[PDB]
């Protein structure tokens, strides 16, 4: 496995520049040679068995295959559950800075987003639980959309924070939707704990292998929706109301191959990515000791805090574009929380990353 091969220089989007695992390609090619593409069921045993297998070997978490469901995308499932677990006008809690699509999904459903900003300190990001509860205790707060691992901070929640939150939500009648699409990209010592381990009552855990193996263009996602009534409601909306029960057979095939044979490839990728993130830390801290930037606990996205440099976000952006011809997502796209940050996608060959960092460093100096 070699990721040291290249298949405005851009570092702005959610996906990677790598080709997927060869075992996935070989599996798609085989399914391809069968020629027939008639209607297929997602309630496929192999698919479900592959999921169960992945959770217990990669996450040491036991799940019931019967509670799993299919979805066209993770956001579609978040959107439907929101329509299902709340009334127009009620609130959905999310930690900010947040993944852009959450706002769309929440406000698109004429629901109100209730933000709880995360705090950066000593080592890592933290959620003030008193603040979160102050918001959850609100009568109109009905759902908590939890990004775990958290994008873009890369925070990997600890067993304690998950317990506390699971507890506060049960206490105030707030259902939890856990978006864990980044579950496989963990770098630290503390492992990712699937929400199912602390889950109570009505909850959902939503994921896919699209971010891990870079196959979003195949569509498909899956999740665990608990309380069989919540699950059936979701399904009759998926199949009956919206006519989306028929899955792309290739998305299923890719996941089966990914979860059954993709471990070796995923492990090589994790190492390559972690070193890439490390490279950024070394280059940035050497040039700007004040930064004291640590690599994230998870994710191949670098949420770089530049506030210590007292640089101007727009000036910097101008220099990157016109002078360095590099495209790096300016943190202010996430509202105030991201003022003074830049997000750099490290999911790419290092030769490419080198130019992006060199670019950032030049730009920063050009405007100090």
Ligand X SMILES: *Cc1c(COP(=O)(O)O)cnc(C)c1O
Q: Which residues bind ligand X (CB under 6 A)?
A: 14, 73-75, 99, 147, 151, 179, 181, 208, 210-211, 216, 221, 243, 246
Nearer to ligand X, 90 or 179 (CB): 179
Whole-angstrom Cα distance, residue 152 to residue 205?
Answer: 19
> Of these, 94, 98, 105, 301, which contacts a second copy (CB under 8 A)?
105
Work out whether 27 is an interface residue with a second copy (CB under 8 A).
Answer: no
Work out whether 280 is an interface residue with a second copy (CB under 8 A).
Answer: no
Nearer to ligand X, 52 or 101 (CB): 101
Whether the CB-CB separation of 150 and 192 falls below 8 Å is answered with no
Nearer to a second copy, 283 or 352 (CB): 352
Residue nearest to ligand X (CB): 73
- 79 touches, from ligand X, a second copy, none (C-beta below 5 to 8 Å by class): a second copy
DSSP code of residue 327 = E
- 208 touches, from a second copy, ligand X, none (C-beta below 5 to 8 Å by class): ligand X
Integer CA distances (angstroms), 104 to 78, 179, 334, in order: 11, 15, 13
Nearer to ligand X, 61 or 298 (CB): 298
DSSP code of residue 42 = S
CB of 89 to a second copy, least distance (A): 15
- 329 touches, from ligand X, a second copy, none (C-beta below 5 to 8 Å by class): none
In a 3-state reduction of DSSP, which class is residue 301?
A: strand
> Of these, 78, 116, 225, 329, which contacts a second copy (CB under 8 A)?
78
Cβ neighbours, 10 Å, residue 123? 8
Whether the CB-CB separation of 186 and 192 falls below 8 Å is answered with yes
What ranges in 59-171 are assigned the alpha helix state H? Answer: 74-85, 101-108, 129-136, 159-171
CB of 125 to ligand X, least distance (A): 15
Spell out a b/e string for 164-174, using b for 16 or more CB atoms within 10 Å of the CB, else e.
bbbebbbebeb
Nearer to a second copy, 80 or 324 (CB): 80
Q: What is the 3-state secondary structure (H, E, C) of 180-228?
A: CCCCCCECCCCCCCCHHHCCCCCEEEEECCHHHHCCHHHCCEEEEECCH
Angle between helices 74-85 and 228-236 (to 10 degrees): 110
> Of these, 48, 63, 145, 251, which contacts a second copy (CB under 8 A)?
251
Chain residues in the site for a second copy (CB under 8 A): 7, 13-20, 25, 28-29, 32-40, 72-76, 78-79, 101, 104-105, 108-109, 214-219, 236-237, 239-244, 246-251
């Amino acid at each position: 496995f070699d990721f040291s091969k290249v298949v405005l220089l851009p570092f702005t989007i959610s996906d990677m520049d790598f080709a997927t695992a060869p075992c996935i390609i070989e599996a798609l090619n085989q399914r391809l040679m069968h020629g027939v593409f008639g209607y297929s069921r997602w309630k496929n045993d192999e698919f479900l068995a592959a999921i169960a297998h992945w959770f217990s070997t990669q996450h040491y978490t036991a799940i019931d295959s019967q509670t799993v469901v299919y979805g066209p995308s993770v956001i579609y499932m978040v959107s439907e559950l929101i329509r299902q677990w709340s009334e127009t006008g009620e609130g959905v809690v999310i930690h900010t800075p947040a993944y852009d699509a959450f706002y769309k999904a929440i406000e698109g459903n004429q629901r109100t987003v209730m933000p709880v900003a995360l705090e950066k300190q000593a080592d890592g990001w933290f959620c003030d639980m008193g603040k979160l509860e102050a918001v959850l205790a609100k009568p109109e707060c009905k759902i908590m959309l939890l990004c775990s691992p958290q994008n873009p901070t890369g925070k990997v929640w600890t067993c304690d924070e998950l317990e506390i939150m699971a507890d506060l939500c049960e206490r105030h009648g707030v259902r939890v939707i856990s978006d864990e699409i980044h579950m496989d990209m963990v770098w630290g010592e503390q492992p990712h704990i699937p929400w199912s381990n602390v889950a109570r009552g009505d909850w959902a855990l939503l994921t896919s292998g699209s971010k891990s193996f870079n196959i979003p263009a195949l569509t498909g996602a899956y999740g665990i929706i608990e309380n069989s009534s919540s699950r059936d409601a979701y399904l009759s909306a998926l199949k009956g109301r919206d006519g989306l029960s028929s899955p792309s057979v290739l998305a299923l095939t890719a996941h089966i191959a990914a979860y059954q044979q993709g471990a070796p490839w995923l492990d090589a990728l994790r190492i390559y990515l972690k070193d890439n993130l490390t490279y950024i830390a070394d280059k940035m801290n050497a040039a700007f000791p004040e930064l004291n930037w640590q690599i994230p606990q998870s994710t191949y996205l670098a949420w770089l805090d530049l506030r210590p440099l007292n640089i101007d976000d727009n000036a910097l952006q101008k220099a990157l574009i016109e002078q360095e011809k590099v495209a790096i997502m300016p943190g202010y796209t996430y509202g105030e929380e991201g003022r003074g940050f830049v997000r750099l996608n490290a999911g790419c060959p290092r030769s490419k990353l080198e130019k992006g960092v060199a670019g950032l460093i030049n730009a920063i100096r050009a405007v100090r």
